Paper text:
This unique architecture is generated during LD biogenesis at endoplasmic reticulum (ER) sites marked by Seipin, a conserved membrane protein mutated in lipodystrophy. Here structural, biochemical and molecular dynamics simulation approaches reveal the mechanism of LD formation by the yeast Seipin Sei1 and its membrane partner Ldb16. We show that Sei1 forms a homodecameric ring that scaffolds and positions Ldb16, with the latter emerging as the primary TAG binder via specific hydroxyl-containing residues, as proposed for human Seipin. Thus, we propose that LD assembly by the Sei1/Ldb16 complex, and likely other Seipins, requires sequential triacylglycerol-concentrating steps via distinct elements in the ER membrane and lumen.
Sei1 protomers are characterized by an 8-strand β-sandwich capped by two orthogonal short helices (α1 and α2) at the inner surface of the ring protruding slightly towards the membrane side. On the outer diameter of the Sei1 ring, just underneath the β-sandwich, we observed a short helix parallel to the plane of the membrane (α3) that sits on top of the two TM segments. Although the two TM segments are encoded by amino acids at the very N- and C-terminal of Sei1 sequence, they come into close proximity and show extensive interactions in the folded polypeptide.
Residue numbers in the entry:
A (entry chain J), B (entry chain A), C (entry chain B): 24 to 132, 145 to 265
């Protein structure tokens, strides 16, 4: 097994190539905890946060995942793509309708213009719902693990929202169209701001960072093996 | 089996290296029993405790796990990272909503400034919940073992709260946003205060003490074997 | 099988060594039956017993396990560590909340100063709880065996309470913070008073008497075998 000592020399150079081609400041994950929350009844919940624009050569800071309201940093003359990663629990307070429709509306700063709308059917927990002991044995003994693997509504929206730093505010509206529910947003829910590169492949690599490392470390094995043949 | 008598000589030297590089006073676990408890209805429960600052060369004492209110000792000119280890049982008194959201708020001593906020979905015990005999056979015969492995809500927050000894008081707020519940905090719940070292690897070793010993005693086997080859 | 006749000569000498190094009067188990019981509603149940101090060379008596109120004998100028072994059944009289929190408070004789506080989550029997025939087959046919293996709340607190013989009275408070329950204390529940030796290893051997015999009789096998080699 001589492949174990040479694979670090491949992963290090691939990591250096990835950071050279995709800088670390090209993507920013902004959790919804860092937004401002406005709860209503005719619009659901509102996730609005102002945008701060910094000039070139200013070392774009990252968003601290501390749950505090922070301005979203974006490069001034740059166009960003938004990846909405939303995980939430729906809990029926009334009418116990087990399946509902979640309305997702994205606005930007003549008051606010809507730039994205979508619907996602979501399963909602009812008081009559019970958890069988078969699910405990298979889906992990922990009740929270069973709820996460069974009732957690995961909503991913990538490469569909375009935002410019010239706009001052961005708002996200979440509403259920059938009945009022208790929406528990998972703390890992957030919006990832990606720089939209014109090379095409870089945008795909940003969206698939985990898959990109696997493909890169599997495709450098031919470079590793070609020096063996010579 | 000649490896059994030489492994103590490796674990002893690795322990000496660990204590030389990470002193025993670099981390302090302060259980929530040693805080002051203030129970409300508009903020939940409050875990506040004053800070005592001692000068250099004063032999930082540890926190006695006796459940008595003790001041938190921190070095004067040192910045500490807080690891919140929180285990608790949620028990529904009313409305028997099986899943709730726990709000964790951390303050510090112009009255109090919030330095951390987060949410954690938690499972709550209801009166209709029953424990199947299948869970008794698999998750240990003891009822408390089944509750610990099934209903205990474990919340770990590491490397996200930064505290300075210049501040006098630190507060921790726990609240459920949906309904009022009976929160039974596990006696092992507490906050671990770690010194933030600038070397980077030392901070990682403090956070992963159990894993660090395993890696160290597995990586010294090459030093053990190299003297065999010579 | 010649090891069967020589192992008594090893266990006898190890027992003699244990009694020479740890005298028989170095530990005293005082069951809670021998305390005085005061039942309240704002403090739960109170386990208070006065201390008798005898001078040196007085042959410290043991506590008779007869359920009668007896003074606790401790050496005059000696510091004792308390090991609280508490087994109890919780039975819900009202509100049938299946899980509760037990508050343990230890005082000593300006009226009484608290020296230890802790909480232990305990499972409580409800009237709706039923015992499946599967548990009868596996956890012993006897109903009391199933309750002991399933519902008995075992609370062990060792090496956390320090008491001096200069104090006259020691009190133990047991209370459930959620609801009033019927606490049935197991007759074997009690407090073990250990002498705190400065050698460190003796304190560990007192706390692990059963494990200490096993380790000692397994470590004297090398002394047994070394005379075979010579």
């Amino acid at each position: 097994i001589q492949l174990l000592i040479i694979l670090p020399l491949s992963i290090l150079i691939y990591h250096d190539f990835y950071l050279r081609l995709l800088p670390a400041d090209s993507s920013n994950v902004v959790p919804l905890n860092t937004f401002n929350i406005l709860n209503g009844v005719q619009f659901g919940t509102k996730f609005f946060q102002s945008i701060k624009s910094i000039p070139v050569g200013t070392d774009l800071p990252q968003t601290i995942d501390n749950g505090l309201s922070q301005l979203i940093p974006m490069r001034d003359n740059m166009e960003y793509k938004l990846d909405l990663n939303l995980q939430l629990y729906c809990q029926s307070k009334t009418d116990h309708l087990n399946l509902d429709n979640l309305l997702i509306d994205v606005y930007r700063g003549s008051k606010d213009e809507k730039i994205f709308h979508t619907s996602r059917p979501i399963v909602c927990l009812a008081l009559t719902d019970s958890m069988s002991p078969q699910e405990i044995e298979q889906l992990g003994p922990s009740r929270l693990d069973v709820y996460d693997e069974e009732w957690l509504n995961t909503i991913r929206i990538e490469d569909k929202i375009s935002l410019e730093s010239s706009y001052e505010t961005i708002s996200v509206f979440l509403k259920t169209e059938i009945a009022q529910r208790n929406l528990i947003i998972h703390p890992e829910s957030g919006i990832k701001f990606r720089m939209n590169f014109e090379q095409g492949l870089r945008n795909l690599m940003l969206r698939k960072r985990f898959l990109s490392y696997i493909i890169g470390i599997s495709i450098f094995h031919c470079i590793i093996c070609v020096l063996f043949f010579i």
